[PDB]
Design a protein around this nucleic acid. Structure first.
Ligand SMILES: Nc1ncnc2c1ncn2[C@H]1C[C@H](O)[C@@H](COP(=O)(O)OP(=O)(O)OP(=O)(O)O)O1
Ligand SMILES: [Mg+2]
Length: 903
DNA sequence: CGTCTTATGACAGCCGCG
DNA sequence: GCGGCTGTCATAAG
């Protein structure tokens, strides 16, 4: 098989690479790399290398990288361009790996660990690292074993060995419920002393050296902590054993309050799972404690223990060890579901970068573009510095705030990348400019055709159609990968809906979940095998369909991000090809394209419909249009449709067979009008929304820009067995909104759109009646702990100081000197509750770390002094009032004037 | 070392207001 | 002692 890299580092004049040879064995190299850079030269200077604009360059080979850096600064001291790849690590991979990398993941040692550390005086700081590590669980993907390092003896207790037999037992038999799947994969190692455990851990680290280090929060806790603890006991030299190349870096970043350390292990790609989640998950969570995320991702209970963690090792060492194990395992199950490491490797090897550079899309693209550029023997520009500058973005329509009964929506397939292609927008494909008319004339088609030689954008730019661009090129490859995985995702989602109808009446049977690829549309035979199955068999099938869909999701949405991020890279001063003429060519074209097609969509329907000058497009954002479908439904009445599904099928058939080709006609005309390389503007039918047949439900409603809800029956060819609410922007969708309140506002919106005004008031009346009974956490608001320092007037609120910030200050006074209480960390989320007048906390509100409960020290005061009236109005009724008004509804009851007829 | 603009709402403080 | 406005902040939609 082909050879592929594991890690790579630059150290001085030596490149340190770990890799896999033709055999699948893992080797290392120390390479004394001889990089090449480039400089322009006169025309008559024969050469194979040219810059991207067409200009001759001579290659300058160098003895070593220091000398190549020495040259880059001198070229600037003189002030001439130093073209080429300034980052020599990427150049070396590009040299060593002159092909498309296919990689054997089973040969890649992904390690996954967590440590435990008892502390009676509050959170154990890794900076200091002043407490014993009393447990570590290190899972190794190659061995497929969890290595448990256990400390029987410590200043904080002498404990007996952990019993696997006990750990296996269920928590109702008095055990730990450590999963079946992992009981035969634990290798357990008790230790008398710390020094011993550590040394063994280090030796173990040497023979099973992690290529990808991951885990929950390891980057800010685990890694730093083991490093410093080992460093303080055995000296810094021993600590460096953690790096296979024996080189490390300490990035101390003293927050305005206390210390904080970041350790770089050369030779290892640390991918902390917390960061991979934030980037790739497309969620904004109330809290990021593993405990919370496990719940959310896996529907799986909180690892339970009595008393505080600080004395679990002494109370119940058995539990203590088991939780450190299951903690490791959970991250493995989350990744089984989400595939973020899989993703990371894909992009990583695709771009040919260090795996941990998947976090920076600027890096990713620089390497993709360089590699692509290198094979055509072209020289890349030098990165140049730039001031930051605003530039205009997308166009959003102001919708008339109303109820909407029948709504059909349409959206462009990857707008900004398609534009990039359609127009051939790239650094080296720029043809010049042209005098631009008010954009509203290009929208209307009045303005002079800007050029009939060059491909154009309404911002005034012109592009070549002859030659093809680096960016269009590279953006197209990844787009197709996106497209493929989107295909599988959407199929899985349909297969999901087919299984959902099957369990409306499952065949009384003892059967077998079918052996099938959930990525593809269930064929007839298998659909007819489907309904003959049992609930047990069918649920397993659903579960699996769902796991496929989610996996397709990840692959799809993250590749979508990467390309959209190429666009965003164009508007970013740090990007080698940073360029605002291109960035605005994209967005301005986006604006024209969205309004242009509004006009056409509005024109065609007024035609086919009968009237003239009726606004059918009620709304649109960047690349979407939401068309009102009332008058089209009105062209057959309420009668002719048997059931709900009959008018859905209709609209779908109408969109597909009448509207779409009209759209297509419109967009290819615009393509001509703009003289673009290729027509690539596609609006796929997205949503079909309305009320269920002969019900008093409102279908949809807009409140303003970015704020609407709809009742959807079909989303992009998927015919849900249950109508699903599509809610955008409203507080139900915001992680700041209290949990129970998200659920309530949602049941409301579901009530307005499906049932009607009647149902709303009924449920509204119930909710406020029961409100005071809800769990304080479930009804707390969430915010981020930012800039506490800045607003701290020596203990009290400063000028301008925000609500949640104010809440945090009151907390910190109410926990003065108490070091057992959880402090609040900068940047992390807090729960927020308002306080009643006269409370003993001083202020009108309080805040505490989210994902956790408030410490007992204040727990019972906050619960007494809690302010429900305020909470209900600010968090539930104000929001509901917003929705209510727009929809023309009341959520309560008007002044009868017919009350005179009571009883 | 470093994706982007557009837009909403909860709040704070400012200002006018017999 | 408020409703209208502006700016800061947190957080959505694309
Ligand atoms: N995270 C982002 N960064 C930069 N630009 C974005 C981002 N999200 C969206 N955009 C811009 C460019 C998109 O093409 C345009 C419309 O976005 P959107 O419709 O969500 O997806 P898309 O049109 O790129 O693909 P698709 O509609 O197929 O999911 O808005
Ligand atoms: Mg789109």
């Amino acid at each position: 098989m082909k050879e592929f890299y594991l890690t790579v580092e630059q150290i001085g004049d030596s490149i340190f690479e770990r890799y896999i040879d033709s055999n699948g064995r893992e080797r290392t190299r120390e390479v004394e790399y001889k990089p090449s850079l480039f400089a322009h030269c006169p025309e008559s200077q024969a050469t194979k290398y040219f810059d991207i604009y067409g200009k001759p360059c001579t290659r300058k080979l160098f003895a070593n990288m220091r000398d190549a850096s020495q040259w880059i600064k001198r070229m600037e001291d003189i002030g001439l361009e130093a073209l080429g790849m300034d980052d020599f690590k990427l150049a070396y991979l590009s040299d060593t790996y002159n092909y498309e990398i296919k990689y054997d993941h089973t040969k890649i040692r992904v390690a996954n660990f967590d440590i435990e550390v008892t502390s009676p005086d509050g959170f154990p700081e890794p900076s200091q690292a002043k407490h014993p590590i009393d447990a570590i669980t290190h899972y190794d993907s190659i061995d497929d074993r969890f290595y448990v390092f256990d400390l029987l003896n410590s200043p904080y207790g002498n404990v007996e060995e952990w019993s696997i037999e006990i750990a296996a037992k269920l928590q109702e038999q008095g055990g730990d419920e450590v999963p079946s799947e992992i009981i035969d994969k634990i290798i357990y190692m008790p230790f008398d002393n710390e020094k011993e455990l550590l040394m063994e851990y280090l030796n173990f680290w040497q023979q099973k050296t992690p290529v990808i280090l991951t885990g929950w929060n390891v980057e800010s806790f685990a890694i730093p902590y083991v490093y410093n603890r080992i460093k303080n006991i055995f000296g810094e030299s021993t600590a460096k054993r953690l790096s296979p190349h024996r080189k490390t870096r300490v990035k101390v970043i003293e927050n305005m309050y206390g210390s904080r350390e970041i350790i770089t292990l050369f030779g290892i790609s640390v991918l902390d799972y917390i960061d991979l989640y934030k980037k790739f998950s497309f969620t904004n969570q109330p809290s990021y404690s593993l405990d919370y995320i496990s719940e959310f991702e896996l529907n799986v209970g909180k690892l339970k223990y009595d008393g505080p963690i600080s004395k679990l090792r002494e109370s119940n060492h058995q539990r203590y060890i088991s939780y450190n194990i299951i903690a490791v395992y959970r991250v493995l199950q989350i990744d089984a579901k989400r595939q973020f490491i899989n993703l990371s490797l894909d992009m990583g090897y695709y771009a040919k970068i260090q795996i941990q550079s998947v976090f920076s899309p600027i890096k990713t693209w620089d390497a993709i573009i360089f590699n692509s550029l290198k094979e055509q023997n072209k020289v890349i520009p030098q990165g140049r510095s730039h001031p930051v500058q605003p530039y205009p973005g997308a166009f959003v329509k102001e919708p008339i705030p109303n109820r909407y009964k029948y709504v059909m929506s349409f959206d462009l397939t990857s707008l900004y990348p398609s534009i990039i292609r359609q127009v051939n927008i790239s650094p080296e494909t720029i043809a010049g400019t042209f005098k631009v008319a008010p954009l509203h004339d290009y929208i209307n088609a009045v303005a002079e055709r800007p050029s009939d030689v060059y491909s154009c954008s309404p911002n005034g730019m012109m592009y070549y159609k002859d030659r093809d661009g680096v960016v269009p090129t590279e953006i197209t490859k990844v787009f197709n990968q996106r497209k493929e995985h989107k295909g599988y995702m959407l199929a899985a989602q349909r297969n999901g809906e087919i299984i959902k109808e099957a369990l409306h009446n499952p065949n009384l049977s003892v059967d077998e979940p079918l052996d099938v690829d959930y990525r593809f549309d269930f064929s007839d035979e298998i659909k007819e095998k489907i309904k003959k199955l049992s609930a047990k068999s069918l649920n397993e099938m659903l579960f699996r369909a769902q796991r496929t869909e989610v996996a397709g999701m990840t692959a799809q949405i993250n590749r979508k991000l990467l390309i959209n991020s190429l666009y965003g890279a164009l508007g970013n001063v740090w990007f080698r090809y940073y360029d605002l003429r291109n960035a605005t060519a994209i967005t301005t074209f986006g604006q024209m394209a969205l309004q242009w097609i509004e006009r056409k969509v509005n024109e065609y329907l007024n035609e086919v419909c009968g009237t003239e000058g009726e606004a059918f497009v009620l709304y649109g954002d960047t690349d979407s249009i939401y068309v009102s479908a009332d008058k089209i439904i009105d062209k057959v009445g309420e009668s002719k449709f048997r059931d709900t599904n009959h008018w859905v099928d209709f609209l779908d058939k109408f969109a597909r067979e009448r509207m779409e080709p009209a759209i297509d006609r419109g967009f290819r005309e615009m393509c001509e009008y703009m003289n673009n390389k290729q027509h690539l503007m596609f609006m796929d039918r997205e949503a079909i929304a309305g009320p269920p047949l002969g019900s008093k439900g409102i279908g949809g409603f807009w409140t303003g820009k970015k704020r609407y809800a709809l009742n959807v029956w079909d989303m992009e060819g998927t015919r849900y067995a249950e109508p699903k609410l599509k809610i955008m922007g409203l507080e139900t969708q915001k992680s700041s909104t209290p949990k129970a309140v998200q659920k309530a506002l949602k049941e409301c919106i579901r009530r307005m759109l499906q049932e009607g005004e009647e149902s709303l008031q009924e449920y509204f009346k119930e909710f406020e009646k029961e409100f005071r009974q809800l769990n304080y956490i479930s009804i707390a608001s969430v915010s981020s702990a930012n800039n506490i320092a800045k607003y701290d007037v020596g203990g009290f609120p400063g000028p301008k100081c925000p609500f949640h910030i104010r809440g945090i200050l009151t907390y910190n006074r109410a926990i003065k000197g108490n070091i057992d209480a959880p402090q609040v960390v900068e940047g992390e989320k807090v729960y927020v509750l308002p306080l009643r007048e006269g409370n003993p906390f001083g202020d009108k509100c309080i805040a505490w770390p989210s994902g956790t409960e408030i410490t007992d020290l204040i727990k019972d005061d906050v619960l007494h002094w809690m302010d429900y009236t305020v909470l209900l109005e600010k968090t539930f009724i104000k929001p509901l009032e917003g929705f209510t008004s727009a929809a023309k509804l009341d959520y309560e009851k008007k002044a009868s004037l017919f009350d005179m007829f009571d009883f």
